Amino acid sequence: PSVEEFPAENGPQLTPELAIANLQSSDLSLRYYAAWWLGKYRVKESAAVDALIAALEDEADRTELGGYPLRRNAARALGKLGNRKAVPGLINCLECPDFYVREAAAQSLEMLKDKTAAPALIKLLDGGVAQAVQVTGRPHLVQPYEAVLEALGAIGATDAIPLIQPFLEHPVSRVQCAAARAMYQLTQEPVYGELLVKVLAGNDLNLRRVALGDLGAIGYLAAAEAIANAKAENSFKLIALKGLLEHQMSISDQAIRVMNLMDSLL
Amino acid sequence: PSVEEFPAENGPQLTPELAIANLQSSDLSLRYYAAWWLGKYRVKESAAVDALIAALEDEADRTELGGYPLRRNAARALGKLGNRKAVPGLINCLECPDFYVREAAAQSLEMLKDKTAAPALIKLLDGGVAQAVQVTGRPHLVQPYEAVLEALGAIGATDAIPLIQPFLEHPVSRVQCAAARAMYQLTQEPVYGELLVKVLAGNDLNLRRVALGDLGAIGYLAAAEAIANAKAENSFKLIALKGLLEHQMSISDQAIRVMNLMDSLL
Amino acid sequence: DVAAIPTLIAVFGYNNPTAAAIASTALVQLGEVAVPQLLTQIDDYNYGARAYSIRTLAAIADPRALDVLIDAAATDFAPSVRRAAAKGLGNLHWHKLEFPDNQTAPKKALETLLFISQDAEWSIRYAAIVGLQGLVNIPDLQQPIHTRLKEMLASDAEKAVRARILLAQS
Amino acid sequence: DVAAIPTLIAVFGYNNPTAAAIASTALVQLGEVAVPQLLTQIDDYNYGARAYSIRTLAAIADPRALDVLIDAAATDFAPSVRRAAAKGLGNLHWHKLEFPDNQTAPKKALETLLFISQDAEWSIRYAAIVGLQGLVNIPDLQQPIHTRLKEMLASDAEKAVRARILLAQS
């Protein structure tokens, strides 16, 4: 009888083989859990990948407003496995009627970095900022703009710049941050990196975390001391510094400068 | 590249068989880790128990002031496995020169509840409170009084009462709390339960947590609303209430009263 | 005041239970209008804070929180988070959903609660029973609940959990 | 003031990095005298707080903290805690220990650092290198460090970690 911050178990004790099998269980909760487990434990075996791809077409599990819970978790898992075999199925999920599938797919396509997703990502920006509204009673915008913009940056879709640039004036702060990130990735203009730096200085913690991840992803060197001094957890600081370090890669004085900051956040 | 509060890994990926084997590795760190792992995952297989018992006589791993790191971790692990085959070896550890082995053994003997440890526990109270001092530069008392007193309560060693009772005036607050717990267990007098209640009201968080665990262990019903209102995490509150509930065990109004409080801490 | 919602949520990140419990009470009094921001400003990196978000959503009981609560109950590692979600899952105001999601939703809650009732930690199983009892107001769901509860009363190692089952069976 | 030590430590439990960082600075200035209470008032139920305890012990660098730091580095689940301990392990003031623990202690630190340098998380391996570099002031330990560092420069997936190895090799 005792208290644990991080428990031995959070669920059935699984192995890769068993998680993969459980994707086809009659227990839908167990399928859902298994798909999360495969992503969490980064089980990159080809049969895990194939099974998750198949679960992108699940019809057994449905929720509120015609959602597809297992498709969401499968989509999210595929992005963590690094296997671009998933790209076409994820691309298809960008036209899923369930918002949260579209979101999960766009986030995973951002992680996989495959440029073959560009046209389908571009289509979700149809109508531009004017159409980028929130439907009443929904806790989300009409499309997962944040993930879509981040994904278009990550895959190097330079043709999308003129569609992306207007989102810097979107009313939602998270959307503007994503558009700043994407704009920097696609144009390399410091002014867009600086907007991410300014979010670091902001009153909003979650936003600071996002800005850290973005500054890491783009490798914007000038933000190093602002990253190291930001009001956020060291974990996010180190990930941001690591991305800066990787862009500056033996050893320049700029790399050393970044390592010295990383050393101080341990 | 991402941040996790609770990581997939904290170490080599082990199974029971592999953890058990690793107890005899030439890598001492790996033995240390494996002994922790076996306790953390509560691997109660008989061969895990036997291997940990053998590690109570380790001589390969030594630290500062003649400490025995693997003996400490083995001792701690054995208490979580519930196997009283360990009792004699744990008893032997009560005369180990390393304080932290003695401490670990006494804590595990408290968890195993075996009355055959009483004489060896009693011997560590030699000299009483007057001898229960701190040696200069050591971050501990001369004996693990807290664990020893708790253990003597838990095993029902009523002959020790007159040796225990003086520790209610020990200068260290944790020692007094343990003596209150033990006194209650061994005499069932409410006055000793009330002292634990009063610690709940105190300025010291860690002490509140200890008092919660103790109130649970003794099942002191009158403390229920004080437990539910205490300034501590719900996890500790629920463990305390659970112990109260178990003492009050179909369904009395006292059990219901406790369940209703437990319901409100979720 | 509605403008203060994000600040109230941010309070859960400062680990002062007194202050957090006040911010949560405030959110709950605001009710439905705070639900969208509560759902999208969950601290995924601080379990202490997250537990307050989940508790607050559970107390508001807007059924739009179903999928967050299911995730929390099923895949979170923090017990304080999971228990809060388990309780919440049996008590959302299902009729607020457009037909027939008002029928589907409680059934998905039930599936999750049945799943977490197998967890190895006693306190998760306890919370799962409490959630399950909350689903008594729904006629289609009573058979599997009865059934599950009998299997648990038979098999459970823990006297605490058996007792709570007994209280639920009443 | 020495009477305030327990209060300073308790501040780490209120998740305000500004306030915690002030309490930690205060503890560090007090130095050796705070080490016993820092070692025995570690919050095992709040990783945020625990990381500050470990960081504070590491900055004070009293070698009596060796066993706590080894535990934290080797068996804690929280990365912030482990990284703080890994750095600390290479920088304790070993000569403060009575002979020959002044020789044994750094060697145990090394063993732990070698062990955690295999972890799967890049940031743990990074911190492990930093700890290992700190052990350069000790002649008996240089061979295994060199050796380990070459094996890691050869095998490491992460450019960040390879770079930090290069910086250490200088």
Side-chain angles (χ1 to χ4, degrees):
Chain A
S2 95
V3 172
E4 283 181 76
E5 187 179 28
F6 311 101
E9 33 60 53
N10 85 325
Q13 215 89 68
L14 297 178
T15 63
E17 321 70 50
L18 195 40
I20 294 157
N22 286 341
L23 290 171
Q24 279 308 314
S25 163
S26 41
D27 184 343
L28 305 177
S29 285
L30 186 60
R31 299 184 169 193
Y32 182 87
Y33 182 90
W36 171 89
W37 191 98
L38 288 168
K40 171 60 174 190
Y41 292 83
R42 292 204 191 245
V43 176
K44 313 184 142 151
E45 276 165 38
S46 63
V49 173
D50 292 355
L52 290 161
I53 293 168
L56 302 178
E57 292 165 355
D58 185 59
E59 306 279 3
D61 195 354
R62 305 298 294 274
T63 192
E64 298 184 4
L65 306 177
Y68 291 91
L70 180 64
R71 288 188 194 193
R72 300 168 181 179
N73 270 12
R76 293 173 186 131
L78 289 166
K80 291 172 91 306
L81 304 186
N83 192 323
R84 298 185 169 200
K85 189 170 177 186
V87 166
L90 292 164
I91 287 169
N92 284 345
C93 283
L94 302 174
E95 285 300 292
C96 186
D98 177 358
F99 170 94
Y100 291 102
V101 172
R102 305 201 296 287
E103 191 173 53
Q107 289 164 344
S108 290
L109 289 165
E110 184 280 337
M111 294 177 76
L112 294 169
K113 317 291 175 223
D114 194 325
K115 208 176 148 142
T116 68
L121 294 163
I122 285 171
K123 171 131 56 138
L124 298 185
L125 303 186
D126 281 354
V129 161
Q131 301 213 357
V133 301
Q134 179 153 350
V135 168
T136 277
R138 305 292 184 238
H140 58 75
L141 304 171
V142 290
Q143 298 293 351
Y145 291 107
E146 178 174 7
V148 164
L149 287 162
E150 283 186 347
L152 286 165
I155 75 187
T158 50
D159 289 336
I161 286 163
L163 309 178
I164 293 169
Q165 187 159 0
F167 288 80
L168 294 156
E169 303 189 334
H170 195 280
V172 177
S173 278
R174 287 178 67 112
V175 173
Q176 295 177 300
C177 188
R181 178 200 198 278
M183 283 304 291
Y184 187 90
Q185 291 177 295
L186 300 170
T187 73
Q188 296 296 106
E189 292 282 350
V191 67
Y192 296 126
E194 291 298 313
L195 284 162
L196 297 170
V197 173
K198 190 201 203 284
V199 170
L200 285 185
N203 71 30
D204 182 345
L205 181 58
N206 313 284
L207 250 181
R208 299 204 289 273
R209 299 172 171 159
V210 162
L212 289 163
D214 290 349
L215 287 159
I218 69 181
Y220 184 54
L221 186 67
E225 294 73 25
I227 285 161
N229 297 322
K231 294 318 90 202
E233 300 70 17
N234 292 341
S235 282
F236 290 101
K237 298 186 193 199
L238 290 163
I239 292 297
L241 297 167
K242 174 186 198 275
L244 265 67
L245 178 51
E246 290 166 320
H247 184 234
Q248 299 311 124
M249 302 283 114
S250 292
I251 303 306
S252 91
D253 308 278
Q254 297 292 23
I256 288 156
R257 170 199 176 189
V258 171
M259 287 189 287
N260 292 336
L261 293 165
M262 291 175 75
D263 293 9
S264 66
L265 298 175
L266 322 164
Chain B
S2 95
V3 172
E4 283 181 76
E5 187 179 28
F6 311 101
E9 33 60 53
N10 85 325
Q13 215 89 68
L14 297 178
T15 63
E17 321 70 50
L18 195 40
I20 294 157
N22 286 341
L23 290 171
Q24 279 308 314
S25 163
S26 41
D27 184 343
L28 305 177
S29 285
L30 186 60
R31 299 184 169 193
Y32 182 87
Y33 182 90
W36 171 89
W37 191 98
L38 288 168
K40 171 60 174 190
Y41 292 83
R42 292 204 191 245
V43 176
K44 313 184 142 151
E45 276 165 38
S46 63
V49 173
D50 292 355
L52 290 161
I53 293 168
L56 302 178
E57 292 165 355
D58 185 59
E59 306 279 3
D61 195 354
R62 305 298 294 274
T63 192
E64 298 184 4
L65 306 177
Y68 291 91
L70 180 64
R71 288 188 194 193
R72 300 168 181 179
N73 270 12
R76 293 173 186 131
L78 289 166
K80 291 172 91 306
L81 304 186
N83 192 323
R84 298 185 169 200
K85 189 170 177 186
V87 166
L90 292 164
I91 287 169
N92 284 345
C93 283
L94 302 174
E95 285 300 292
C96 186
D98 177 358
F99 170 94
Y100 291 102
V101 172
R102 305 201 296 287
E103 191 173 53
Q107 289 164 344
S108 290
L109 289 165
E110 184 280 337
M111 294 177 76
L112 294 169
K113 317 291 175 223
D114 194 325
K115 208 176 148 142
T116 68
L121 294 163
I122 285 171
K123 171 131 56 138
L124 298 185
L125 303 186
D126 281 354
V129 161
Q131 301 213 357
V133 301
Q134 179 153 350
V135 168
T136 277
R138 305 292 184 238
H140 58 75
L141 304 171
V142 290
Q143 298 293 351
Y145 291 107
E146 178 174 7
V148 164
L149 287 162
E150 283 186 347
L152 286 165
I155 75 187
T158 50
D159 289 336
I161 286 163
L163 309 178
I164 293 169
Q165 187 159 0
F167 288 80
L168 294 156
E169 303 189 334
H170 195 280
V172 177
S173 278
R174 287 178 67 112
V175 173
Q176 295 177 300
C177 188
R181 178 200 198 278
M183 283 304 291
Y184 187 90
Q185 291 177 295
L186 300 170
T187 73
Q188 296 296 106
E189 292 282 350
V191 67
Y192 296 126
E194 291 298 313
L195 284 162
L196 297 170
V197 173
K198 190 201 203 284
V199 170
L200 285 185
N203 71 30
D204 182 345
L205 181 58
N206 313 284
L207 250 181
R208 299 204 289 273
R209 299 172 171 159
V210 162
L212 289 163
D214 290 349
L215 287 159
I218 69 181
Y220 184 54
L221 186 67
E225 294 73 25
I227 285 161
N229 297 322
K231 294 318 90 202
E233 300 70 17
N234 292 341
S235 282
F236 290 101
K237 298 186 193 199
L238 290 163
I239 292 297
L241 297 167
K242 174 186 198 275
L244 265 67
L245 178 51
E246 290 166 320
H247 184 234
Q248 299 311 124
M249 302 283 114
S250 292
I251 303 306
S252 91
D253 308 278
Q254 297 292 23
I256 288 156
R257 170 199 176 189
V258 171
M259 287 189 287
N260 292 336
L261 293 165
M262 291 175 75
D263 293 9
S264 66
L265 298 175
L266 322 164
Chain C
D1 181 63
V2 171
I5 304 294
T7 301
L8 290 163
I9 291 164
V11 169
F12 301 157
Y14 306 124
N15 175 33
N16 189 266
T18 309
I22 286 147
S24 178
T25 300
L27 288 156
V28 171
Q29 278 161 14
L30 284 164
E32 255 76 41
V33 65
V35 169
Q37 280 164 299
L38 283 161
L39 298 166
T40 56
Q41 294 174 22
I42 291 170
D43 194 335
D44 288 329
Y45 307 96
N46 174 344
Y47 68 79
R50 185 161 70 257
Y52 284 111
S53 292
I54 301 301
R55 194 166 320 104
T56 301
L57 288 157
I60 295 173
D62 180 319
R64 293 177 286 172
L66 176 69
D67 294 334
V68 162
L69 270 37
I70 286 176
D71 274 346
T75 60
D76 212 290
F77 281 97
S80 49
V81 168
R82 302 183 71 200
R83 295 185 301 246
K87 187 177 184 196
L89 276 170
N91 296 105
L92 302 186
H93 296 152
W94 316 114
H95 69 267
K96 302 243 50 144
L97 295 173
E98 178 167 18
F99 179 100
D101 283 348
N102 64 310
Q103 293 175 356
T104 302
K107 167 66 184 166
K108 298 303 289 170
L110 172 61
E111 292 160 11
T112 287
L113 285 164
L114 297 175
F115 174 83
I116 61 164
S117 76
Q118 304 135 19
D119 200 85
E121 159 60 35
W122 72 272
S123 72
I124 299 316
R125 302 197 292 290
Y126 187 102
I129 305 307
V130 176
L132 290 171
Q133 194 186 309
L135 295 169
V136 160
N137 62 347
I138 294 136
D140 289 10
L141 303 189
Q142 307 189 339
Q143 179 273 129
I145 291 167
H146 289 157
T147 288
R148 176 60 190 149
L149 288 178
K150 294 180 233 299
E151 293 149 37
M152 281 179 84
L153 194 57
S155 71
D156 212 286
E158 295 281 351
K159 246 198 285 184
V161 171
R162 287 202 232 100
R164 186 64 184 73
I165 288 162
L166 294 167
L167 181 57
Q169 276 153 347
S170 317
Chain D
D1 181 63
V2 171
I5 304 294
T7 301
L8 290 163
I9 291 164
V11 169
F12 301 157
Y14 306 124
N15 175 33
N16 189 266
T18 309
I22 286 147
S24 178
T25 300
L27 288 156
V28 171
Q29 278 161 14
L30 284 164
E32 255 76 41
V33 65
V35 169
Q37 280 164 299
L38 283 161
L39 298 166
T40 56
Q41 294 174 22
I42 291 170
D43 194 335
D44 288 329
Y45 307 96
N46 174 344
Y47 68 79
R50 185 161 70 257
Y52 284 111
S53 292
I54 301 301
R55 194 166 320 104
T56 301
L57 288 157
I60 295 173
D62 180 319
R64 293 177 286 172
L66 176 69
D67 294 334
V68 162
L69 270 37
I70 286 176
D71 274 346
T75 60
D76 212 290
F77 281 97
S80 49
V81 168
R82 302 183 71 200
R83 295 185 301 246
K87 187 177 184 196
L89 276 170
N91 296 105
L92 302 186
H93 296 152
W94 316 114
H95 69 267
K96 302 243 50 144
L97 295 173
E98 178 167 18
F99 179 100
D101 283 348
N102 64 310
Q103 293 175 356
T104 302
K107 167 66 184 166
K108 298 303 289 170
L110 172 61
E111 292 160 11
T112 287
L113 285 164
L114 297 175
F115 174 83
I116 61 164
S117 76
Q118 304 135 19
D119 200 85
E121 159 60 35
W122 72 272
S123 72
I124 299 316
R125 302 197 292 290
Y126 187 102
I129 305 307
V130 176
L132 290 171
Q133 194 186 309
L135 295 169
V136 160
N137 62 347
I138 294 136
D140 289 10
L141 303 189
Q142 307 189 339
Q143 179 273 129
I145 291 167
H146 289 157
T147 288
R148 176 60 190 149
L149 288 178
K150 294 180 233 299
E151 293 149 37
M152 281 179 84
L153 194 57
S155 71
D156 212 286
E158 295 281 351
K159 246 198 285 184
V161 171
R162 287 202 232 100
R164 186 64 184 73
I165 288 162
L166 294 167
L167 181 57
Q169 276 153 347
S170 317

